[PDB]
Design a protein around this ligand. Structure first.
Ligand SMILES: [Mg+2]
Ligand SMILES: [Mg+2]
Ligand SMILES: [Mg+2]
Ligand SMILES: [Mg+2]
Ligand SMILES: [Zn+2]
Ligand SMILES: [Zn+2]
Lengths: 99, 99
């Protein structure tokens, strides 16, 4: 139901479905995953993590599959959006194509 | 000065620099390249090309290098934008990060 486009700035993973392009914050995603494993209300939010990390394609595949099966895939436990999404339609329109 | 993120929908190539993320229309790009080779005022605009084409990573590298060295990299000969660009800052802001 989705396609992984790859990593950007060692900070975001780009994934798309039939409607949207998602920029998935890999730090906020790992934060949510570890929270669902271990619901620790008191862990520091990873919005402060600045250094990038190059991920293997296998690790990206595992992270994005986990994300797609998450019960709360939209926001970290602190309420920061895990991703920013863009309608594919917008991208097509900007070069003159209908989607 | 740029980084190739990869192909989307067999229609766009994603490339970024230090400021922007570019969605490069591969058909309009090839149109501009063939125009600079062969300045034919009367060739049909490729805005109508609908079918996708999976490109090799080598071919994508050659296309994007050519694009980056183009004298007119912004628009096809008919005036359709070859790319849509997004400030990286916007993407970072949407998850709560400053860029
Ligand atoms: Mg959620
Ligand atoms: Mg939810
Ligand atoms: Mg131009
Ligand atoms: Mg010009
Ligand atoms: Zn958080
Ligand atoms: Zn044209």
């Amino acid at each position: 139901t989705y396609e992984i486009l790859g990593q950007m700035d060692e900070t975001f993973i780009l994934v798309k479905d039939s409607e949207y392009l998602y920029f998935v914050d890999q730090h906020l995603l790992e934060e949510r995953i570890n929270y669902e494993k271990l619901k620790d209300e008191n862990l520091a939010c990873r919005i402060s993590v600045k250094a990038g990390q190059k991920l293997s394609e296998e690790k990206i595949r595992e992270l994005i599959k986990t994300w797609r099966n998450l019960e709360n895939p939209h926001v970290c436990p602190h309420g920061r959006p895990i991703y920013y999404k863009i309608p594919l339609r917008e991208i097509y329109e900007k070069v003159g194509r209908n989607y």
